[PDB]
Structures are given as structure tokens and as C-alpha cells.
Amino acid sequence: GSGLKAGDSFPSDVVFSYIPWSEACGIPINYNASKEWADKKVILFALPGAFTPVCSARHVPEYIEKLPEIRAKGVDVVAVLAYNDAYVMSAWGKANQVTGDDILFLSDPDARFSKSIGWADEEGRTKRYALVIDHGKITYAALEPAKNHLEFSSAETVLKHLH
Amino acid sequence: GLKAGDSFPSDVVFSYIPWSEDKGEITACGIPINYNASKEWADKKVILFALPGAFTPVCSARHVPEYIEKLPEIRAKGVDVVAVLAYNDAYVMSAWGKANQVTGDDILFLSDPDARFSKSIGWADEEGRTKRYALVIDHGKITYAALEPAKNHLEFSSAETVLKHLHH
């Protein structure tokens, strides 16, 4: 794909899938990220898969812990992204005890967004990465050097790249 | 696809996480192991049912809960193994198992990696998922095989229908 870097515009027509907040016969609908985020400061972190074990990388739990610090830096939306469908993503959000949309759990259908920028792996999963998108402009972008390497996409690290 | 009388294919391998431990629906540090169904089932009576995906709401198909309700009946008809199959990876399937409050191996939650088995028998869709179907396999021999006519049509693979075929 293309890559993404600071200074780039966030791609247009980026559409994910998700189940909107509450409450259960939730149905997946489109999440038009390009449109929704145009006037927002956003953190988006992607990872290999929902429900990876507790003993492995603490990607999501660290974002939950650092959420007060992230809000203090003026971030409006935090989202986690993976290739799992919106049903699995939504159940994973519940399993992580995230309520009231504090962190959005989004599906990248067939990893098509991730593929379009060259950040999907050989098996159709997203890679592990983070993007800070401020009003449609990328201000932080980092791809982890390996699947279970947690560093450049971590909440701690992303926090150092927020004013 | 598959029909009664046929032999269950050789070298069919699924992925799963054996049940254990504390939390829901998070596996502590479970690790996917190969499940060699062809070999495991050679001397057993088995119900295998597949569906489009883990964590699909019950209001669009009460597939797993009905097998759970019918499990004492199913065992009383001599079935050794009951297994649900889907294209989701073993971590997701294991979580779905806990979310259904299934413990031990009462029902196995198995992954069909990239729907490859389902694909090999022509029972997968274009989206890379398994279709919804059921198989009764008795010591390596298929005695019941039905594919549902639609994705969220639950009839020929339901616990109640499979049971009718067991009782006969």
C-alpha cells in the first residue's frame, strides 16, 4: 500500500464497521471515519486480533488506564481497530469492560483500510500500529516492527506525541 | 459436499484452546493447538455443527444455546463429542465458549482456519466464512449431513432436527 506519515491527510472514504452504543440484537453498521473525524482529534490504534490472551501484549488495557491523560491532551476519540467483524469487536469491548463508548471498538472489514496503506500482514490481519489524526491531518504514525512488539503504538508513546 | 454413507475426510485439522481457568471471556494465556478431528473421531460418535461466526447474536440464530439445552438428550443417544465450528481463530472461539457459559468440553469450540475444511467440502461462502451446517459422524462414517439453504436459516442443523435423526 502507501504508508502514512505526519503531514499526510487522512485518506478519504475510510469506512469501518461497528455496533453503536447500547444495548441484545445489535446490528453492525458503517462508521464513516473520514467524515466523523474531520473535525476531531483522534487516536486510532490497530492490532492483530480481538481476544488475544491476557498474558500477551497489554495494548488495550494500557489505553484504558491512560484515558484520563489522553483526554487531558484534548483527544476527542480513542479507537481500537482489528480485522475481526463488528460482533467480535463489540464483545471484546465488553470483555475489556469498556462502557459508554470511552474507546470505540472498530472493525476494518477484510483489513481493507490497513491493506490500502500497506499495514496488513500476510494472513489478512491488521498489523499493530497507531495513528494520531487531528482534524483530518496525521500528526503521529508508527508501525510496530513485529506482531507482538508493543512500543511505538503504545498509549505511553502516543502520549509523548500529543500537545 | 458430504452425504450419509460417505467417509469423514482424512487429515481434517481444526484449531482450538482447551477449556480451563478463571476469566470470561479472556483466556489467561491459552495457546491454539491443532485438533486432529479425523483421528480423534475415528472411534467416536460426534455431532459437528458449523455457523457463519462467533458472537453472532442469538436473535438471528439461537444455534449454540439450543444444543446446550439438548445436551443431556444428545448424550443419551450415545454421542461422545459435540463441537461447534466457525472461521474465527481459536482465541475468539474460546472466548465465545465462555460467553455461552460452556465449561469443560461439554461443547467444543473449534476454529476452521480460513474455513479450509468447509472450503474443501464446498460448504464455505465467498466471504471466507463457513456456512451453517451439521454433520453426524459415527466412527468415521457420516450418518447425517445437511447444509442450510441460507446464512441465518436455522433448521437442518438445529439441535432439535439433528436429534430427530439420532432418535431414528
Residue numbers in the entry:
A (entry chain A): 1 to 23, 30 to 169
B (entry chain B): 3 to 170
Pull verbatim passages from the article behind this deposition:
We experimentally confirm the predicted peroxiredoxin activity of Asp f3 and demonstrate the functional contribution of its cysteine residues for catalytic activity. Finally, we provide evidence for the critical role of Asp f3 in fungal virulence, wherein it protects A. fumigatus against oxidative stress in vitro, and in vivo, in a murine model of invasive pulmonary aspergillosis.
Aspf3 wild type (WT) and its C31S/C61S variant crystallized as a homodimer and showed a typical thioredoxin-like fold. The WT protein was captured in its oxidized state, with two intermolecular disulfide bonds across the dimerization interface between C31 and C61 of the individual protomers. The crystal structure of Asp f3 revealed its homodimeric configuration that includes two intermolecular disulfide bonds. Salt bridges between R131 and D91 from the two protomers and additional hydrogen bonds between main chain atoms (T29-V60, A30-V60, A30-C61), as well as residues involved in hydrophobic interactions (I28, A30, F57, P59, V60, V94, Y93, A97) contribute to the extensive interface interactions. The WT, as well as C31S/C61S variant, exhibited close similarity to oxidized and reduced forms of Ahp1, respectively. The residue at the active site (C61) is the peroxidatic cysteine (CP) that initiates the peroxide reduction by nucleophilic attack, when present in its thiolate form.
